[PDB]
Amino acid sequence: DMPVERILEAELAVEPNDPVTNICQAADKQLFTLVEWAKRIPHFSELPLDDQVILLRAGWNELLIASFSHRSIAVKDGILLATGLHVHRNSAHSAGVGAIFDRVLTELVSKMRDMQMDKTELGCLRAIVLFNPDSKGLSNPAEVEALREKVYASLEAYCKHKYPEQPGRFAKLLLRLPALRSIGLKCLEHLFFFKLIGDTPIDTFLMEMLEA
Amino acid sequence: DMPVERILEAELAVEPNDPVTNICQAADKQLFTLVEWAKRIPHFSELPLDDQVILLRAGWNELLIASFSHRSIAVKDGILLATGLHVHRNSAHSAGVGAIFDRVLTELVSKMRDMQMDKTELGCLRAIVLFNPDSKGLSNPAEVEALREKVYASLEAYCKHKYPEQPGRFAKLLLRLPALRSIGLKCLEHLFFFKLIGDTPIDTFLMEMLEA
Amino acid sequence: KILHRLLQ
Amino acid sequence: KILHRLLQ
Ligand SMILES: Cc1c(-c2ccccc2)cccc1-c1cc(/C=C/C(=O)O)ccc1O
Ligand SMILES: Cc1c(-c2ccccc2)cccc1-c1cc(/C=C/C(=O)O)ccc1O
Q: Are A10 and A151 in contact (CB under 8 A)?
A: no
Asked whether the beta carbons of residue A208 and residue D2 sit closer than 8 angstroms, the reply is yes
Q: What is the DSSP letter of B75?
A: S
Residue B53, φ and ψ in degrees, nearest 5: -60, -45
Q: What is the DSSP letter of B137?
A: T
Q: Please, which experimental method was used?
A: X-ray
Q: DSSP letter string over chain A? A: ---HHHHHHHHHHT----HHHHHHHHHHHHHHHHHHHHHTSTTTTTS-HHHHHHHHHHHHHHHHHHHHHHHTTSSTTEEE-TTS-EEEHHHHHHTT-HHHHHHIIIIIIHHHHHTT--HHHHHHHHHHHHS-TT-TT-S-HHHHHHHHHHHHHHHHHHHHHH-TT-TTHHHHHHTTHHHHHHHHHHHHHHHHHHHHH--S---HHHHHHT--
Q: What is the DSSP letter of B199?
A: -
For ligand 2, is residue B34 a contact (CB within 6 Å)?
Answer: no
Asked whether the beta carbons of residue D3 and residue A205 sit closer than 8 angstroms, the reply is yes
Does residue B112 come out as left (phi exceeding 0), alpha (psi in the -120 to 50 range) or beta? alpha
Asked whether the beta carbons of residue B53 and residue C3 sit closer than 8 angstroms, the reply is yes
Q: What is the DSSP letter of B47?
A: S
Nearest alpha-carbon partner for B205 in B1, B38, B27? B27
Residue nearest to atom 11 of ligand 1 (CA): A187
Cα–Cα distance, A171 to B179 (Å, whole number): 17
Q: Are A144 and A85 in contact (CB under 8 A)?
A: no
CA B179 to centroid of chain Cα atoms = 12
Whether A207 has its CB under 8 Å from any CB of chain B: the answer is no
Asked whether the beta carbons of residue A174 and residue B179 sit closer than 8 angstroms, the reply is no
Q: Annotation-wise, does A71 bind a ligand?
A: yes
Q: DSSP letter string over A45-88? A: TTS-HHHHHHHHHHHHHHHHHHHHHHHTTSSTTEEE-TTS-EEE
Q: DSSP letter string over B140-197? A: -HHHHHHHHHHHHHHHHHHHHHH-TT-TTHHHHHHTTHHHHHHHHHHHHHHHHHHHHH
For ligand 2, is residue B44 a contact (CB within 6 Å)?
Answer: no
B191 CA → ligand 2 middle, Å: 8
The continuous run of DSSP H or E covering B86 comes out as: strand B86-88
C-beta neighbour count of B165 within 10 angstroms: 5
Neighbours of chain C (3+ CB pairs under 8 A): B
Write out chain B residues lying below 8 Å of A185, CB-based.
182, 185
Select from A107, A128, A185 the Cβ nearest to the Cβ of B134: A107
| CATH code linked to domain A1-212 | 1.10.565.10
Resolution (A): 2.7
Q: Which residues are paired to B87 by β-bridges?
A: B79
Select from A39, A49, A204 the Cβ nearest to the Cβ of D2: A204
The continuous run of DSSP H or E covering B78 comes out as: strand B78-80
Whether A170 has its CB under 8 Å from any CB of chain B: the answer is yes
Q: Which residues are paired to A87 by β-bridges?
A: A79
Q: Are B26 and B82 in contact (CB under 8 A)?
A: yes
Q: How far is B108 from chain C (nearest CA, A)?
A: 28
Q: Point out the ligand nearest to the CA of residue B87.
A: 2
